[PDB]
Amino acid sequence: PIMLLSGHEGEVYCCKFHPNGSTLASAGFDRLILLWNVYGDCDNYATLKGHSGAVMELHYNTDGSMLFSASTDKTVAVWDSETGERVKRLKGHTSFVNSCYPARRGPQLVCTGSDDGTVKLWDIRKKAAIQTFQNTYQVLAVTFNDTSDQIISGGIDNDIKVWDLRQNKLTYTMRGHADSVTGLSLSSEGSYLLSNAMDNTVRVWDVRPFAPKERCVKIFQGNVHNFEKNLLRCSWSPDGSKIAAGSADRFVYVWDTTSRRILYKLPGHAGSINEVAFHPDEPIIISASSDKRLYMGEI
Amino acid sequence: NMLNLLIHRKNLNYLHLDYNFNLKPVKTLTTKERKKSRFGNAFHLCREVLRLTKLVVDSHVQYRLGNVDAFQLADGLQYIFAHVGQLTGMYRYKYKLMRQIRMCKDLKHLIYYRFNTGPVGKGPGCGFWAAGWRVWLFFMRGITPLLERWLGNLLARQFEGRHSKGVAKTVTKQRVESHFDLELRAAVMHDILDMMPEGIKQNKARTILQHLSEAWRCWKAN
Amino acid sequence: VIRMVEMQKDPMEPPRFKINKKIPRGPPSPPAPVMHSPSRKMTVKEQQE
Amino acid sequence: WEDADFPILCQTCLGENPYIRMTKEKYGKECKICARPFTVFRWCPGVRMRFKKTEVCQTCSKLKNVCQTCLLDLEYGLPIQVRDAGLSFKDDMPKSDVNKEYYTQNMEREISNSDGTRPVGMLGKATSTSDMLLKLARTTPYYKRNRPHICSFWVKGECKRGEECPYRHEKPTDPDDPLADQNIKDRYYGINDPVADKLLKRASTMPRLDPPEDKTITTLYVGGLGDTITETDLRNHFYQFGEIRTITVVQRQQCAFIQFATRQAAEVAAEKSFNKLIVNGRRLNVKWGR
Amino acid sequence: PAHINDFMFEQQRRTFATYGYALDPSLDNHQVSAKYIGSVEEAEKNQGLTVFETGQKKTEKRKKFKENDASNIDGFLGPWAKYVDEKDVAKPSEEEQKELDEITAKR
Amino acid sequence: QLSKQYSSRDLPSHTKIKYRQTTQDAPEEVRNRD
RNA sequence: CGGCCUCCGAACGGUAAGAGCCUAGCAUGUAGAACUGGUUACCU
RNA sequence: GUGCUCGCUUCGGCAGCACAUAUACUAAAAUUGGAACGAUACAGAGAAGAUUAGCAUGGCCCCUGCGCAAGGAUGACACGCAAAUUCGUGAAGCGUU
Ligand SMILES: O=P(O)(O)O[C@H]1[C@@H](OP(=O)(O)O)[C@@H](OP(=O)(O)O)[C@@H](OP(=O)(O)O)[C@@H](OP(=O)(O)O)[C@H]1OP(=O)(O)O
Ligand SMILES: [Mg+2]
Ligand SMILES: [Mg+2]
Numbered sequence A: 001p002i003m004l005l006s007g008h009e010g011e012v013y014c015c016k017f018h019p020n021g022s023t024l025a026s027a028g029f030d031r032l033i034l035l036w037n038v039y040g041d042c043d044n045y046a047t048l049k050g051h052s053g054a055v056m057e058l059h060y061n062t063d064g065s066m067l068f069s070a071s072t073d074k075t076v077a078v079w080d081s082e083t084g085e086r087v088k089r090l091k092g093h094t095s096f097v098n099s100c101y102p103a104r105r106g107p108q109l110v111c112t113g114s115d116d117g118t119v120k121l122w123d124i125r126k127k128a129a130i131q132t133f134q135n136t137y138q139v140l141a142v143t144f145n146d147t148s149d150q151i152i153s154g155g156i157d158n159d160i161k162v163w164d165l166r167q168n169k170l171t172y173t174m175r176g177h178a179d180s181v182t183g184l185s186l187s188s189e190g191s192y193l194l195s196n197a198m199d200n201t202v203r204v205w206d207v208r209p210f211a212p213k214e215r216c217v218k219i220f221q222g223n224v225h226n227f228e229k230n231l232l233r234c235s236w237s238p239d240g241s242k243i244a245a246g247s248a249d250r251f252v253y254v255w256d257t258t259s260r261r262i263l264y265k266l267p268g269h270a271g272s273i274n275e276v277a278f279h280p281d282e283p284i285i286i287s288a289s290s291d292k293r294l295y296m297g298e299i
Numbered sequence B: 001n002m003l004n005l006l007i008h009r010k011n012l013n014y015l016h017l018d019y020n021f022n023l024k025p026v027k028t029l030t031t032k033e034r035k036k037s038r039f040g041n042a043f044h045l046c047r048e049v050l051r052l053t054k055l056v057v058d059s060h061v062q063y064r065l066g067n068v069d070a071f072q073l074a075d076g077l078q079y080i081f082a083h084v085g086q087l088t089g090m091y092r093y094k095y096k097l098m099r100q101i102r103m104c105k106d107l108k109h110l111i112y113y114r115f116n117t118g119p120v121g122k123g124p125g126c127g128f129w130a131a132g133w134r135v136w137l138f139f140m141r142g143i144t145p146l147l148e149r150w151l152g153n154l155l156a157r158q159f160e161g162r163h164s165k166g167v168a169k170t171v172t173k174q175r176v177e178s179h180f181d182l183e184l185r186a187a188v189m190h191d192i193l194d195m196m197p198e199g200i201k202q203n204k205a206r207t208i209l210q211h212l213s214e215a216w217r218c219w220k221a222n
Numbered sequence C: 001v002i003r004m005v006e007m008q009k010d011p012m013e014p015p016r017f018k019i020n021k022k023i024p025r026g027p028p029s030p031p032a033p034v035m036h037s038p039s040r041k042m043t044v045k046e047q048q049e
Numbered sequence D: 001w002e003d004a005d006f007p008i009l010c011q012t013c014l015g016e017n018p019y020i021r022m023t024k025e026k027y028g029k030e031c032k033i034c035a036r037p038f039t040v041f042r043w044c045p046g047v048r049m050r051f052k053k054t055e056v057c058q059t060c061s062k063l064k065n066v067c068q069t070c071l072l073d074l075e076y077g078l079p080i081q082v083r084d085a086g087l088s089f090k091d092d093m094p095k096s097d098v099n100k101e102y103y104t105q106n107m108e109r110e111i112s113n114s115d116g117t118r119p120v121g122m123l124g125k126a127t128s129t130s131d132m133l134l135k136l137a138r139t140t141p142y143y144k145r146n147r148p149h150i151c152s153f154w155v156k157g158e159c160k161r162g163e164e165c166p167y168r169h170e171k172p173t174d175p176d177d178p179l180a181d182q183n184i185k186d187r188y189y190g191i192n193d194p195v196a197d198k199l200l201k202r203a204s205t206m207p208r209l210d211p212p213e214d215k216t217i218t219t220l221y222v223g224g225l226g227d228t229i230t231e232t233d234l235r236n237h238f239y240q241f242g243e244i245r246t247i248t249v250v251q252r253q254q255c256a257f258i259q260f261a262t263r264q265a266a267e268v269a270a271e272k273s274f275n276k277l278i279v280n281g282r283r284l285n286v287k288w289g290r
Numbered sequence E: 001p002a003h004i005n006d007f008m009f010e011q012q013r014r015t016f017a018t019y020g021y022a023l024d025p026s027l028d029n030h031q032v033s034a035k036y037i038g039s040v041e042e043a044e045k046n047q048g049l050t051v052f053e054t055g056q057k058k059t060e061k062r063k064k065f066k067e068n069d070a071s072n073i074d075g076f077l078g079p080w081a082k083y084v085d086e087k088d089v090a091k092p093s094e095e096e097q098k099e100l101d102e103i104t105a106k107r
Numbered sequence F: 001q002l003s004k005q006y007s008s009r010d011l012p013s014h015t016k017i018k019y020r021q022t023t024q025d026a027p028e029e030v031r032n033r034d
Numbered sequence G: 001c002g003g004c005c006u007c008c009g010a011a012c013g014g015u016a017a018g019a020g021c022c023u024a025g026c027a028u029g030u031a032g033a034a035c036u037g038g039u040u041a042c043c044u
Numbered sequence H: 001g002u003g004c005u006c007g008c009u010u011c012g013g014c015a016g017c018a019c020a021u022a023u024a025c026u027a028a029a030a031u032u033g034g035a036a037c038g039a040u041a042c043a044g045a046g047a048a049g050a051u052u053a054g055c056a057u058g059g060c061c062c063c064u065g066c067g068c069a070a071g072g073a074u075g076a077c078a079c080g081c082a083a084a085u086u087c088g089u090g091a092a093g094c095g096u097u
């Protein structure tokens, strides 16, 4: 079925699954985080509270045991999916922290991209900062590398940047996007990384020990920007088979890794789609849009 | 101003409401105007309530101008509340008021006959106006929803117009007989003169009804 | 792209328009076909009756 | 009472900015024609332009197919009389009080059974846009409509409101002009509206190809041909329109002379092509040869 | 029935109002690019500056008065300070005046 | 075309519907009975 | 040791009903407003 | 316009940052039209011989009333062929096949 979900008062910016594929988390302008059950009637059990600013990015851990959520109010937050309660308020960010990423399968460690001009590394236990690479400017998305030893970030200056956690210098800078990059997501290959950018083009890259020195692999057309400049986010499928993107055009764009063909431009929405979520188990799609509700498409 | 705007909107130029809320004609009115210019209990209940309040606020204005006194104001207010019957003439329009009126008498007999227990005399100077004030405030608590309904209806009817299309008036006590005969002869016309016919051409039902009325008079005459 | 906003209603405002207008009732619906059984005859004697 | 989703208005009258902000008022005013209460929508046309308002019911609009405030037709955009004449329509909407209220009631009951998609009645049976209509049509938005009125004060000198004078502080138009007094009721009913008569005289003085005297003059002269045309192209211009009997493509004068097989066919072709047979961008002049 | 964000619509509208060009709103099923609609050359030469975004403008602001000491009895213009480059009367003159008299007679 | 007139008898009254209780005769029992 | 103290006022139903007549009021405060000027040639 | 730049940097300005972000049926008008149950004058009251009580029905008739009550001459108005699909005998006379 289409299964449209509602109950959010303002835009929903972020929607993602339990890494179980059991529960649903969505969040946006309303400054709180709603949860649902993916199966049955797609019903709502819990609501997490506390974040004073807009929830700009929610992120799971790789088991699903604690929840990370970047807020507009200069703070990140980690909470207990067990309870929904705050364990840590990552303060210290000197501006709008938009992006958050918990280290997967490494020591518990977090990279946060913010509007201060720094990327910040934090340990959850110490209540203190680890490292911080002030390049010059706002960083809009951040993701680790599966070694938990490089950190990738995308901002306003269009050159995707990667730092080595040990030498702490600009390890890898990649170029070719015509305007600001808005989204990074590294496939479960640990290798292929996906980049949305409102210049209307999406790109694919690969962080390896050895890469061709110019690793701009695949390129797809279709995404849109407009006077909104909303933050646009992408994802790989669980399989690295289909790329899903949203855009300010009300069209859910589903493409393939293989033939780069347009498998879908699906209508159904009313406002810009900000985030598409793939089920880690199923062919289930969840769209978070600025029309103050969500969609549950089955393909 | 509201009541005058009402009077003059209905195009009743021959009447005027003076400054103590008395309504007075400035001509001698023919029948057509004696009829066109009759008003209801909504208009008059509003008139009389405003007259009570003007009496009160004007006693206070006399106090504030320097004309009277603190004691004369207090006793004059007590007076006002005890004698609403002889100052307003409200009971004419909602006669249930006498509940209140009798109450403000009973209180006065209490207070007075405890006020003047000693050398204090039977004279005017007794203003302890809490009790009657309370009484008329509770009256107003009750009357405001009523009057808001009545005035809403009056204003609607004055601005939209009265609905003479689907009135559908009940059957009361003056229309019991006429209605019995309406329905009896409707029934008779349904009954055979259209459902046991085969006097095809024109079944003459208007003449069978004449037979029905004459059979009834013949019953009555034996 | 247009922004709809609904204008405030003044609480103290009487109705604005005259409601009571009379007109004859409209034409009904297209007459349905009269599906009867064929008529039989009335002799002269019955019409006498 | 009517109830709408948006106005239905000319692009001229809707404004210039792509982004407009507009207010609705439920049961706000009375249609000057339908006589019943409507919902009234008000928008600011542009910078320093008067706020405009929808001035006719949505049914009173769908019936005659016009813009609820601009009042001009929806596709072409001429006065209602002009469009009616060009569609050769005969609109029978009643005039007297009781008959008109009754007609409005039943027309509304029947338009309730619609899809909200196209006008009801002959306005679907008359959409064959004649070249006269297309020829009179406005081309770009005559946005002089939305400037404010004439300041009685600033016409007498008095508009002491500085530059904020609530009306265009220019010269008042001479009231003798026919384009001055056009009551809304007539402009909707199309009875003696001066702009309609002026535009009709303009359409009568507009160039159209003239017919000859003799029936035997079945050679048609097309002037301004150019040497990018072929005899087969002149055919394709005058081939399926009937039958052509011969074609002389005069290259020494850049013209053509088409002998036809049916007089009405060639007449329709050439008159319909008069200065407007635009094949390969050439203004050919269709006339009857000697 | 769209649902859009609020700061952005007013930003674009005020842009088109005071600058004359705007990021066109067409959300077409054929992917158009960001095109400045209206006074396109003005958007080009002005670098797309919005009325809300601060930008360098040496434009001569009209001269105004400033009497903001509220102790002078007829002194304080305060927030109600008139513009100094303003006129002191507003009227039409001899030719247009007689012409308007002639028109009001013609009417 | 909705009027703002009003009536003394159209005030809210008896605003809850009584339902037939467990012992009175509820549609369950009469569904059962012989 | 005995006490017991109702009420109370206003309207309609009565002083015709009508067509014309003419002038205040009282309502409106709008919508719209314009555009030009193309022509002939070969053999008896 | 307010403040701060460890801004020039004097205490003149300039600049930068922050803070502050879109009123309004635009009218003092100018229009344009209809009513006052007012005069004016006409006019002039059901039933049945006469004089009179009323309660209704019908609807492009209203008015007073909060009114689904009541009243308004029983509120007014409500009548000249209130003719509808459709004929044929009996006799005579005249002209015709
Ligand atoms: O006019 P009323 O409403 O009936 O009130 C008065 C009055 O009270 P005010 O002082 O407020 O006018 C008298 O009071 P005094 O003469 O005592 O000062 C007096 O009451 P008294 O009987 O006590 O004199 C009199 O009554 P009555 O006519 O029987 O003397 C009467 O009050 P009632 O309600 O007692 O009549
Ligand atoms: Mg009587
Ligand atoms: Mg009689």
Ligand SMILES: [Mg+2]
Residues within 6 Å of the ligand: none
């Ligand atoms: Mg009666």
Ligand SMILES: [Mg+2]
Residues within 6 Å of the ligand: none
């Ligand atoms: Mg009588």
Ligand SMILES: [Mg+2]
Residues within 6 Å of the ligand: none
């Ligand atoms: Mg009657």
